[PDB]
């Protein structure tokens, strides 16, 4: 689902 993994918190 995430597309920009580094933005995950």
């Amino acid at each position, epitope marked *: 689902e*995430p*597309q*920009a*993994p*580094w*933005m*995950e918190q």
Partner: antibody
Amino acid sequence: EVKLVESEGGLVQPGSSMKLSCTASGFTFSDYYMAWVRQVPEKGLEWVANINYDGSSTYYLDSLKGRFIISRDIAKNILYLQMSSLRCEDTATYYCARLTNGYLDVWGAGTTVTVSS
Amino acid sequence: DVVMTQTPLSLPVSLGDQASISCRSSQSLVHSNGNTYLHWYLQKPGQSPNLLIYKVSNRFSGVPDRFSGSGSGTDFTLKISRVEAEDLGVYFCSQSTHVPTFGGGTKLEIKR
């Protein structure tokens, strides 16, 4: 077919502004995150910015100090990069790219921006 | 600030032989969600980069099985078997587990 085409780049005076655009085709535009990256001469590739499906969430390379704005027009299948207060160090080849599951799976042709008086 | 270090800077290979390129990251690329966001791109002369391998070992559409990606954690390798002349160009790795960064590239040179 899938394709990304950047607008013409070119010369801008230091301290001035400019906007790049990128037009997408072949896929459902709003079904994908999008990104800009740049290739600085004698240096490597560097992330610039990315944007989620509807444009409610963006990410920027920190060093940009909020001088750049990434945005997208769903009605027109267009991605923008607004660049303000340009300095010599912003001189580079800018690429727009489609972002999927953390990777860039479609790249544009690149457009060259030169900051100079 | 995650550094991607590629070696060698340039790699000469004979047609039909194998090329092996190393990419190392300064931090583990295993995301908290379990995925390793390490990818490989190829930029041919006069062209934009194209995706070759995503998430360590997955070949992107149209990439032949000659191209193989491997590794884990901080240590990764791209192997190109049976090299063809059209494979030449700059191979670079990239990570997006963390704030995204790119390796400096490895130039594949064809021997003749």
